[PDB]
Amino acid sequence: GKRLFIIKPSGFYDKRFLKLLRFYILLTGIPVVIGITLINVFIGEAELAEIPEGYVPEHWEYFKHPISRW
Amino acid sequence: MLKYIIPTMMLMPLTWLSKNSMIWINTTLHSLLISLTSLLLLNQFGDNSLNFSLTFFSDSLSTPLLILTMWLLPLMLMASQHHLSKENLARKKLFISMLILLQLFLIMTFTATELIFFYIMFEATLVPTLIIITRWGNQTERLNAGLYFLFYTLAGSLPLLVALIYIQNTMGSLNFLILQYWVQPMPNSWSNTFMWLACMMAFMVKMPLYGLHLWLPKAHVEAPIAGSMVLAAILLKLGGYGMMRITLLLNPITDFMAYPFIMLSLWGMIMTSSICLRQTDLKSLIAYSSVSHMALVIVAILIQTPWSYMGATALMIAHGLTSSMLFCLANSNYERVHSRTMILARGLQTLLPLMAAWWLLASLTNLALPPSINLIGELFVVMSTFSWSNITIILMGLNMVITALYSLYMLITTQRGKHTHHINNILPSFTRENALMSLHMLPLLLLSLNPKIILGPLY
Amino acid sequence: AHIEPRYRQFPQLTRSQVIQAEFFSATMWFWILWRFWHDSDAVLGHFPYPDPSQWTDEELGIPPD
Amino acid sequence: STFVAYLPDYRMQEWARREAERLVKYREAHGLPLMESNCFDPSKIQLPED
Amino acid sequence: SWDKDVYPEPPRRTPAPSPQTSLPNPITYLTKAFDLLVDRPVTLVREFIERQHAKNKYYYYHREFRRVPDITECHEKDVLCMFEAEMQWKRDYKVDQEIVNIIQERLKACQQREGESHRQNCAKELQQFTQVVKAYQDRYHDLGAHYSARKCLAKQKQRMLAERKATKEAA
Amino acid sequence: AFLPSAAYLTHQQKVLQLYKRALRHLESRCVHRDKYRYFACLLRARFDEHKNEKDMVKATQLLREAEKEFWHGQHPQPYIFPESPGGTSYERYECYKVPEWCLDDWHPSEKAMYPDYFAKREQWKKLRRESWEREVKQLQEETPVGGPRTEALPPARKQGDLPPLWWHIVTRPRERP
Amino acid sequence: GFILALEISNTTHYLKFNYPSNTFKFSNLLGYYPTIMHRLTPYMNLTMSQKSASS
Amino acid sequence: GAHLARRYLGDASVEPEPLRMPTFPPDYGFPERKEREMVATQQEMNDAQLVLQQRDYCAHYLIRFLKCKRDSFPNFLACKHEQHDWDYCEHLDYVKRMKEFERERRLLQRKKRREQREADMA
Amino acid sequence: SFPKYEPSRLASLPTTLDPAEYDISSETRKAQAERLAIRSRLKREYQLQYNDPSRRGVVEDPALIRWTCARSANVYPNFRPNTKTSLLGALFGIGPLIFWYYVFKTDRDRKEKLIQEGKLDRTFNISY
Amino acid sequence: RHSIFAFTHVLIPVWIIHYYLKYHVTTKPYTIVEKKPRIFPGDTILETGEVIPPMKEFPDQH
Amino acid sequence: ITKDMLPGPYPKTPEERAAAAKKYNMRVEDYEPYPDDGMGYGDYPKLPDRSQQERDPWYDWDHPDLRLNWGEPMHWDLDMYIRNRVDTSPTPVNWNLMCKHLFGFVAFMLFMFWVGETYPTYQPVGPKQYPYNNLYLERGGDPNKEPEPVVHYEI
Amino acid sequence: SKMELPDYKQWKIEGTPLETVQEKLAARGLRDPWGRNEAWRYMGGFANNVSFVGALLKGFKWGFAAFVVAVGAEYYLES
Amino acid sequence: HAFFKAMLFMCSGSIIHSLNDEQDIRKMGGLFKAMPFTTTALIIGSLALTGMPFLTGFYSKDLIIESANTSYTNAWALLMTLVATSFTAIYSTRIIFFALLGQPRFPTLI
Amino acid sequence: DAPPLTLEGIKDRVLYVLKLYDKIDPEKLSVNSHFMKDLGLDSLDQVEIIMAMEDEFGFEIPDIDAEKLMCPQEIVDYIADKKDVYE
């Protein structure tokens, strides 16, 4: 009993902006995180090895992560 | 550097052939695409710079400034489209065209290998900003602000042209890659003293130095929002880039010719922060804060140590982002209440809570809350100036105290307290303003995770 | 239910809070008495203090001259 | 952010660390000093006569 | 894994546990629970990931730079030879910085590891740090933000002139 | 000093304000109830001794020396009520006093949560906009030429109309929103 | 200290009135440190801000 | 604290300075005086990681107490005997220091009396 | 008697100790009536603009605009160079600059002279 | 699902942190520097198996 | 707004003084401009330089937090005399007496701290004795040299 | 909601210190009319509060009894 | 100090909340039997703060005083430390007297 | 915390406090009895009455509103307006 109306400013637009920001961040954040996990698990990182004699590497063969090499 | 110049000039037929209602959408979309494309400049090496051609190159100093410019253009397009709502269509396209032209001149300025081409672009940047200020500004004295800004810049910069041509005739080249290997000591004489003054005064005016800063609380105030953003965020850093490039030729005469400006800029930041303590105008307060931070950058460049240079470039990028966000917030208040007085609209946290959160974050980054890149730059400059002399720690500590004081005075006056009774047109925040605030905030907070890409060419 | 407020009179008390307060006061006094019965040294003194005026000059090595 | 996070060895810092490890191991194995006070050989430098 | 010669570490000597009291220490039970509940699934997951990594194997190499002539054998205002010498000098500057970082990490590790007796047992690390810092200071300090190979050559020439004058006046 | 309806403070008003301030400060010095009762009766006797004085200059000098006496013997920090200005909870709830014009900017989706309240708000606003012209016409003919002399407002003389300038002092927020 | 303050409270309970001393006003008003400093230092700093730098 | 008044309010010729003490040879008045004996080896204190101000002439009791503290976990009230032994030997060392101070004071008084007698004749 | 309250710049005289408060003369009553009339007229203007149901905006205050224009855009038209203004400008403009210049120059000269003799301990200084 | 707080807020972060520390932090040198254990006379080394000799006899006073 | 409501230069004749007093909404007798020394004030009124804390808190102000009225002449330093800043309310003690009492207390405490530093307290004990040449090797001395032997005897 | 106040006849100042204030003022020749208003704080559950030493010694009896019992139990347990 | 200072603040907040946001000790009293648990906690906390033997404050504060007495120390600093200890006792029992003992001074409705 | 108020409770409490006043005969006062005229009280009696009601209800009535509170009904209406009761 005795419930009073609480006058507050319109909180609809601020919540709408926060929901839109979260949705549009996550829309590419979730696939990128999933793809990074799948790159790390299945492709994996490179292993340091000495250069074979007479062989010159490409300029992208000096990096460890697959994404950095790409 | 032609892969960024050509889409920028292709933005011009995009805004001149669009529909009457689709100019903002098209220009914002394609500028954001080119801003995404600008990340390919991060192919920097530990020994050599990224040299594209005879005319263009980009080392690790010009790359953060380029990325900042190309990211700042869509922010100005999003900001400036509410007060140009009722404008004629041709005038709207002319405004967008001046923004595009300014971005083209700015991205040709930071990559110029030749020094005279850098000068030509650096003074070609004057016309679009002067036109923007004096045409789309709202006040009476926008004409006086444009006159002051134009004549301070040109009076500072004509001896720079004369001295650069003298250096070309004496050394044989103005190519920056050649001058790194062909440089010679500059002995102590009156001729070399006036050489140093001529080469330095243009960038001392543009930064600005204390005593030559009288054009800034006019051009920063009577400009529109996009003009204020591009003046605070990029145009003050042309002076910093110029002093970083031109100090190579001015050795060892800098070590005693830098004393008066070091005393002007060490005492000047105290004066400008104290001015910020007693400002009745919000826009003027932000402009004077910009003067203080650029005085810090001036001292860092003038003492010429590695830590000072890294702190100077980090502080330049951080202050550009923070000043742009503060000007945007002040503009949103101006659109709500149609006045720039700081005491008029009070207690807006009870009405605009998320905007109050954005205000709090901008104020926190203004007073260099760690681990923001603001604090990283300010801290590195403080360390290098302590290495220079020990009483500089007294001056820097006083400056930090007054900086925190006026930033929290801004926040407490505008957002806290009892609201104004007779003001009843405080609309809720649009999605556009919140998106603008978040696009200013999120890169600034993300750069604290990888701060190594804004630490200059000697990281 | 809750406690009904009283006008100009001593307020209503629960038996639980009186029991808890008395129990914790008794626990504090029991702890003080127990630790004083056991330790009695951290307050009173650990070792005797020898007065240096009572030391003979022979064990201090004072030559009579 | 994904592009900046996976930059291919920005400004050769990781390579410098690996090369420093190699050089420190090589100099420590043979009893050499780890660093000298002169960057260039004094044998190939002609001082001015005074 | 890393190389244990560049980053040295003394052998670990742990004492045997002697339960003087009859009260069971909870640390052994918590270690049993940690190995049962935490170590085993993490080990199994890493085994699966390493099995996935062993199906395809590719290598990355450490970049090797051959030695070019330095700035001492470059003609003045000859941008090609001076350019190569400057790039080589900058690379050696970076490597020297990371060498000083390695020695600093050694010193910090010794200070933490030796405990309360660190002032006695970390004499060799302190000596190495002092020597390498003196070499770095004599090689690269006081050059400015516009450092180059010519500035370092001039500094070394001035120091050698000072040393020659000092050994002449002491002869 | 500063009064809305009067231009000055009378002598009797000054005496009463001094009496209240002195009794409050004496209560602050004399924290116990019986001690305060005793010294309050002594102060009341002192105030009643000079009650029947017809000399205006002598009463003025008595008031001046009484104010000097109070200023010499005031408490360094007297007891202030929690909601009184200078109190510990003074203007504490001003952050929650949202004005009523913010309800006009609400989205219709959140306006549907309170249908009857917004219907009552609409009829209140209809009443206000209907009565405004009548109340400003009443106020126009009651102000003497040369502007009002005090800040007091007149009531509604006839039947049906509301008092002039009533909206922002009827729809003010509650003390505990 | 316990004995002294018990006696102080017992003397407070009495039916006597005394004018405050300078020691009581020194202790109650925080040693006059905030009343002097927070009125003097902001005055000087803000007057120097407006009369000297701003104007 | 009577020595505080005897040095400050009294005279400083009799009361020794604490910062420079002792000012007399240890063989003065002490025939065939022996040294103190250190029980704990330098390596034993070194590998037990005692604090450098804690490696005084009675660190063997401290090492025993630390071993008792480590081996009695989780019974944190298990052994107070080793703590009491270490504290008693600390008390003995403090008594030694007090004896040294009193010896210095008496030697200074004796020297003052000797110079007073020497002035009495010469 | 009682110690007289001496006013200061930062501690004003109380309104109950002011001898001019107890003035009953007709000139002061006329002045107070005139001040109340001005205040009541201004309040009537404000409340007429304030309680309008058809208004949605800002009740503009000419006093605030007057204050900001006086604080900002009047100082140079009402400035005359005389002895006081020039003296204060030379004291506050070039005074601190010269003082800090001499302080920093002396400190840096002392440090640079100590460095070149090898008297300054710079053993672990490799960051600058 | 009564005790999901002890699973979602403790066990999963413990798994992730133990994985991160075991296979990415302990791999690099001088990342977790731990103070060497305190050694008393009468102890026995695990790795070498040696027995540290007991200390000297005490000159008893109490 | 208009150009005849804005502030102007210093009034000389009583006519422009009366016009300015009417402009700022105040009585001519109570209107005092700043003195004409060239500081740049103009004809802006010199209000009595009191903080907003001294205002009546129970009055119904148009701006309640600032204790300010609509249309009233605004003080030149109003942003400095707000309730968040410099206060000028009367104090229970005279300002000079608080200044002298605080300064005397601080000076006396500093003097007695200096006196106590000059004449410290201690205990009747000798120096603490440490074995192995006052712990020479533990304190960081190099072992290849040999220190002067510090020998502690019994007593 | 609705609350009922107690009687007002029951607030009598006799047996309270307000009676002492009454007789002191009667000796002087004055009166306190508000004495019956403050008379509630001196009667009822608020009468005869403890002193300071009795406040510090709260629960000392049961603590002492438990200490005696525990000491006797430890005395018997060691044998 | 963390434990008993935090709990003293919590009990003061309880007294403040029970008397309608009244933070003045001149409007308190008679709360010894009205609020027994907060009274017990306040007495225990003030005794632990003052340095009652074998409470939590005894194990740190007395060792501080014992080390301050028997050390090479400034004389004046030791003197004002002892006087400040006496003053801590004084204001602790001032709080206990004016907030718990005596007759009620708070408003009528309870 | 903070129990609500009504006009009946406010009137009952204010009449309780005014009934405990020794200078007023309790069988004569009512809700609209005047102070100077109907009860024969001085201005100081009115001031002490107002202070008693302030102490009773725990909030301060300013003097510029205290001079006009002349019968118990105006005191009830002032307290009801200041505390916003019957909402």
Ligand SMILES: CCCCCCCCCCCCCCCCCC(=O)OC[C@H](COP(=O)([O-])OCC[N+](C)(C)C)OC(=O)CCCCCCCCCCCCCCCCC
């Ligand atoms: C924003 C306002 C402030 C702006 C300040 C701008 C800089 C101030 C100083 C500028 C000096 C003029 C340019 C000098 C270029 C020197 C290049 C060079 O080779 O120098 C060596 C040459 C040396 O001559 P030389 O090189 O031909 O000879 C060979 C060398 N010796 C001498 C050894 C044989 O210097 C000169 O020729 C003269 C330099 C001094 C010139 C003095 C006149 C100008 C005075 C200052 C005017 C400033 C702007 C005033 C207006 C402001 C707005 C109203």
Ligand SMILES: CCCCCCCCCCCCCCCCCC(=O)OC[C@H](COP(=O)([O-])OCC[N+](C)(C)C)OC(=O)CCCCCCCCCCCCCCCCC
């Ligand atoms: C750059 C110059 C121009 C400036 C303006 C640019 C405007 C345009 C913007 C374009 C896009 C943004 C560019 C910059 C991006 C910077 C970010 C970035 O990429 O970082 C890379 C960095 C790279 O980190 P790294 O370098 O350590 O990674 C190692 C490298 N790899 C990946 C190859 C192995 O990313 C991270 O650091 C992410 C780490 C994981 C995520 C964060 C986990 C912790 C989060 C907080 C937890 C809670 C803590 C406590 C909180 C308490 C409450 C506050």
Ligand SMILES: *C(=O)CCCCCCCCCCCCC
């Ligand atoms: C000589 O007096 C040796 C003791 C140390 C110096 C005096 C210390 C005085 C203060 C401690 C005693 C206080 C007794 C209530």
